[PDB]
Amino acid sequence: PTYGVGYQPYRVVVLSFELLHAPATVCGPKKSTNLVKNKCVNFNFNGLT
Amino acid sequence: GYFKIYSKHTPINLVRGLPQGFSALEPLVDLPIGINITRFQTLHISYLTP
């Protein structure tokens, strides 16, 4: 604990995003908007726009 | 790369043979296993008895 600032331990985590020619298994969070009814709206349902 | 399993369960009173009739198979589950399959085998249960 009394070592220098540049001599202190840093916990390093390297995230490597691998993208092959295969179907993906990790995706970013999907969002949601409140459902509106009885009104001409631009809807998106699971990619169906 | 998707393994799709469809399933159906029916109460059949026939004793032997594949029954004749129509019954659609609702999908059970799809999995993105992404492997190559060319062969398969079934596993049965065994009843240990004295």
Q: Inform me whether the C-beta atom of residue A23 falls under 8 Å from chain B C-beta atoms.
A: yes
Cα A28 to the chain's mean position, in Å? 3
DSSP secondary structure letter of residue B50: -
Number of CB atoms found within 10 A of residue B37's CB: 7
Q: Inform me whether the C-beta atom of residue B34 falls under 8 Å from chain A C-beta atoms.
A: yes
Cα B46 to the chain's mean position, in Å? 18
Using only the alpha carbons of chain B, give its radius of gyration: 16
Distance between CA atoms of residues A44 and A28, nearest Å: 17
Resolution in Å equals 3.5
CB B4 within 8 A of CB B30: yes
Residues of B in contact with A22 (CB under 8 A): 1, 34
Distance between CA atoms of residues A44 and A6, nearest Å: 50
Q: How are beta strands B3-7 and B26-31 bridged, if at all?
A: antiparallel
CA dihedral over A15, A20, A22, A28, signed as positive or negative:
positive
User: DSSP letters along A1-49, please?
Assistant: --S-GGGS------------SS-----PPPP------SS-----BTTB-
Q: Return the ∠ at Cα A35 (arms to A30 and A39), rounded to 5°.
A: 130
Residues of A in contact with B1 (CB under 8 A): 22-23
Q: Inform me whether the C-beta atom of residue A28 falls under 8 Å from chain B C-beta atoms.
A: no
Q: Inform me whether the C-beta atom of residue A25 falls under 8 Å from chain B C-beta atoms.
A: yes
